[PDB]
Write an enzyme that holds these catalytic residues in place. Structure first.
Site, PDB file in Angstrom:
ATOM      1  N   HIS B  39       0.813  -1.242   0.000  1.00 34.11           N
ATOM      2  CA  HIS B  39       0.000   0.000   0.000  1.00 34.11           C
ATOM      3  C   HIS B  39       0.851   1.300   0.000  1.00 34.11           C
ATOM      4  O   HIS B  39       0.316   2.404  -0.043  1.00 34.11           O
ATOM      5  CB  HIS B  39      -1.016   0.014   1.137  1.00 34.11           C
ATOM      6  CG  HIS B  39      -0.419   0.284   2.494  1.00 34.11           C
ATOM      7  ND1 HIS B  39      -0.458  -0.639   3.520  1.00 34.11           N
ATOM      8  CD2 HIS B  39       0.144   1.402   3.018  1.00 34.11           C
ATOM      9  CE1 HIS B  39       0.099  -0.121   4.599  1.00 34.11           C
ATOM     10  NE2 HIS B  39       0.471   1.114   4.322  1.00 34.11           N
ATOM     11  N   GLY B 141       2.138   4.512  12.973  1.00 33.42           N
ATOM     12  CA  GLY B 141       2.927   5.259  12.008  1.00 33.42           C
ATOM     13  C   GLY B 141       4.241   4.591  11.632  1.00 33.42           C
ATOM     14  O   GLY B 141       5.162   5.241  11.104  1.00 33.42           O
ATOM     15  N   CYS B 143       4.262   1.611   9.692  1.00 33.03           N
ATOM     16  CA  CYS B 143       4.026   0.563   8.674  1.00 33.03           C
ATOM     17  C   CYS B 143       5.363   0.097   8.138  1.00 33.03           C
ATOM     18  O   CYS B 143       6.286   0.901   7.947  1.00 33.03           O
ATOM     19  CB  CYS B 143       3.165   1.020   7.483  1.00 33.03           C
ATOM     20  SG  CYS B 143       1.618   1.546   8.050  1.00 33.03           S
TER      21      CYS B 143
END
Lengths: 298, 298
Positions: B39, B141, B143
């Site tokens: 993503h 925060g 990822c």
């Protein structure tokens, strides 16, 4: 809301084994110096009544075996600094990071790289108790293991493990070899004194809770500092000075909750209880996060 | 008795930043491959309805900016593996450790190296919840951050962080890009199911307590497995299978306390309470230490 250790990479590259005779413990290799507890020079019989300066003046350089992994590092000098040996080796650690040595206060936190015979096994976060000991069986048999903080790229060494006390808590020194607390590096009668809860840290953890959405416990009533300390002391909490109160300034600013208002909430929490309710998904008040840790992790 | 993370040095040397457009997250650099959540290729508008294979077939190699510290690593290939991008870079990580990829079961533990934009900030121990999520705001925060275990010299990567769920718990994949749990890597309605207590781990923690001297809570009465599961389920504990029981074999052997005897003690603990008393200096039952963790740390 989790206890975090600092990443331990910068410290791992510094861990070696030091052996004198049949005794072996961990040492810390920085530049061309190895730091370790001086009781490595002791036989179990010496340890009851050690004459460190006699034992040390009488040892040769080659009687110290220092190993970095499998690799022997020749000792070319030895001196004592308070309760630490400073061993000069013939090789500078190519992994020496930016570092300093700092001495920490009771209530402050740090990470411990627990090692066995020079090999890193795990890293733990902990606080220096108000009685100058550290809790948790994690240091059992890893004399020489170090405690540190990391300030962006600089490792601030603050603790070296020396001993376990009769209640199983740990005692050690700063990296200048001065004990935290009244303890000594011999096998003799010593006792951790009574301990208390780190009031400032519990306040910090209530601010962390507010930051994270949890507001149910906010104060219903006012308190003075003095009335606050009166109740807290009854629950074996440390009294809170004005200067302690002021350390909570930034957390107060960022949340809008006045410090004495948070003292009130804790006072009401101690007296009235959580009654099955949770703060930060915990049923208990946590006292090993400092105000600094909370700002950093939020 | 402390939660320990593995030393994080071997993983730190693998952490990089990956940026696509205005999005940046952490990636893991092993040999000449960088692994990150796919993503990263999404704009906030894409994230509601992403066509990953179209978005990925349509991106050039040079639209990926990979940074190891300040140093750009040129991307020379990109493919997808389930929910992970595998980016070929032109440089093999000189710090690639011995590693494998393993997929973990619910109840099992691992360490997380929490990172911000490729820079290691702290390391945390945690367990995979029975609902295939992980608790604790620590991954907010970061990822791309990875979970791992270390087996002497080999790093077993088991987790990569992808998302935060509406209740604030984290969801992610193994290093083959398959989610743990029913979750998906888009911004849509998803919910962690109900969670339960990891019964096997709470049993392991009671054995750790016995190993450490604490015996007051040993069973006063017998139980069958079935009667045990009947009570435990009422306190939102996971039922215990025969195979779970057998995983406790070594801890039983080393303590002399039969597994069903420890089930009895827990059953009596849930029903009768600690009543102010402590186990391992805790007033609560801990469920994030596996039987393996206990053997290892004792």
């Amino acid at each position: 809301f989790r206890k975090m250790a600092f990443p331990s990479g910068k410290v791992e590259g510094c861990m070696v084994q030091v052996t004198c005779g049949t005794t072996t413990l961990n040492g810390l290799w920085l530049d061309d110096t190895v730091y370790c507890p001086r009781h490595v020079i002791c036989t179990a019989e010496d340890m009851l009544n050690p004459n460190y300066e006699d034992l040390l003046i009488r040892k040769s350089n080659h009687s110290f075996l220092v190993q970095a992994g499998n690799v022997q590092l020749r000792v070319i000098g030895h001196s004592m600094q308070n309760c630490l040996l400073r061993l000069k080796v013939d090789t500078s650690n190519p992994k020496t990071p930016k570092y300093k040595f700092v001495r920490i206060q009771p209530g402050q936190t740090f990470s411990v790289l627990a090692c066995y015979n020079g090999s890193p096994s795990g890293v733990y976060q902990c606080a220096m108790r108000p009685n100058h000991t550290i809790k948790g069986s994690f240091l059992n048999g890893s004399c020489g293991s170090v405690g540190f903080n990391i300030d962006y790229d600089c490792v601030s060494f603050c603790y070296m493990h020396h001993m376990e006390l009769p209640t199983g808590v740990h005692a050690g020194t700063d990296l200048e070899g001065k004990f935290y607390g009244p303890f000594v590096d011999r096998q003799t009668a010593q006792a951790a004194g009574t301990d208390t809860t780190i009031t400032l840290n519990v306040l910090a953890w209530l601010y962390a809770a507010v930051i994270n959405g949890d507001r149910w416990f906010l104060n219903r009533f006012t308190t003075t500092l003095n009335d606050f300390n009166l109740v807290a002391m009854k629950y074996n909490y440390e009294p809170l000075t004005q200067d302690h109160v002021d350390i909570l300034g930034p957390l107060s600013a960022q949340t809008g909750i006045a410090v004495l208002d948070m003292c009130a909430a804790l006072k009401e929490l101690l007296q009235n209880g959580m009654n099955g309710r949770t703060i930060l998904g915990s049923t208990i008040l946590e006292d090993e996060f400092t105000p600094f840790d909370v700002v950093r992790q939020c």
